[PDB]
Ligand binder design. Structure first.
Ligand SMILES: *SCC(=O)Nc1cc(-c2ccc(F)cc2F)ccc1O
Length: 285
């Protein structure tokens, strides 16, 4: 497999930091003017992580339509994702408004609420069936329906109700709970099993809105999730799978949101996940 030996080549030569930096200098730069408006300073978790204006998701409350969220559109793979930051205490209502307005079926969470002794995002869904959440700014109600805790991740069924119309939708929440505080997982196995769980749920499918994917900044682990998903999808779609160049896919995704894949270590891990996930989809059972 092309990338498999390109992987060994990079590894043996300890070249990850050099490839990753070539990616950073090749990466697109587009304006992020809405994100920088003073009125939006507290809608951003990080000052240096902003959605591009061209791809940003707009809340349909036109009032302030801003949310730190980007639409990543992968045209050949026919996949779309919304990558967003972990919601802030003051943007949880916006997050669920986005989920509602974009008709998303799944939310993918790749971080824990607290990591490294700091809060990486707000507790934005209910932890008990009987204790639902009501977001009064956006007129939404969110109920925990069911929770399936597994060794490496948790899947939850949620009910999102639009209070103004009394329509309800079921949202699936896929929470990868075991990414390490430092570095990347030692093996990609649990991450792929997580990815295939999201796929199996139907959440990534074109009949629904884009899956909403987040970590804390919405670029690192979140970038790794989408990048692997799209590369594997392309390797199945193309006549020759070895024509799939992960670096090119990354650069295409970076046209939609800055900074995807934060460290050379995440890049290496992304390669590893795609190579291993290939074995599970280009054959086998
Ligand atoms: S790990 C793959 C997966 O789909 N897991 C999972 C799915 C669901 C669910 C609920 C409702 C529905 F209409 C479809 C569906 F797949 C619930 C829990 C769970 O772990």
């Amino acid at each position: 497999m092309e990338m498999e030996k390109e992987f060994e080549q990079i590894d043996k030569s300890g070249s990850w930091a050099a490839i990753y930096q070539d990616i950073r200098h090749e990466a697109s730069d587009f304006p992020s003017r809405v994100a920088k408006l003073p009125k939006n300073k507290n809608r951003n978790r990080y000052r240096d992580v902003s959605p591009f204006d061209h791809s940003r998701i707009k809340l349909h409350q036109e009032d302030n339509d801003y949310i730190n969220a980007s639409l990543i559109k992968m045209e050949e793979a026919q996949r779309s994702y919304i990558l967003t930051q972990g919601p802030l205490p003051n943007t949880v209502g916006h997050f669920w408004e986005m989920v509602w307005e974009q008709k998303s079926r799944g939310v993918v969470m790749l971080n824990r609420v607290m990591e490294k002794g700091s809060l990486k995002c707000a507790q934005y869904w209910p932890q008990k069936e009987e204790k639902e959440m009501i977001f009064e700014d956006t007129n939404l109600k969110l109920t925990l329906i069911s929770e399936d805790i597994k060794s490496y991740y948790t899947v939850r069924q949620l009910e999102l109700e639009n209070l103004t119309t009394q329509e309800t939708r079921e949202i699936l929440h896929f929470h990868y709970t075991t990414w390490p505080d430092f570095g990347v997982p030692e093996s990609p196995a649990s991450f792929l099993n997580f990815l295939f769980c999201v796929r199996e749920s139907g959440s990534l499918s074109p009949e629904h809105g884009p899956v909403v994917v987040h970590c804390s900044a919405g670029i690192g682990r979140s970038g790794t999730f989408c990048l692997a998903d799209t590369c594997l999808l392309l390797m199945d779609k193309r006549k020759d799978p070895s024509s799939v160049d992960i670096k090119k896919v990354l650069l295409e995704m970076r046209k939609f949101r800055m900074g995807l894949i934060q460290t050379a270590d995440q890049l290496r891990f992304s390669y590893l996940a795609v190579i291993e996930g290939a074995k599970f989809i280009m054959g086998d059972s």
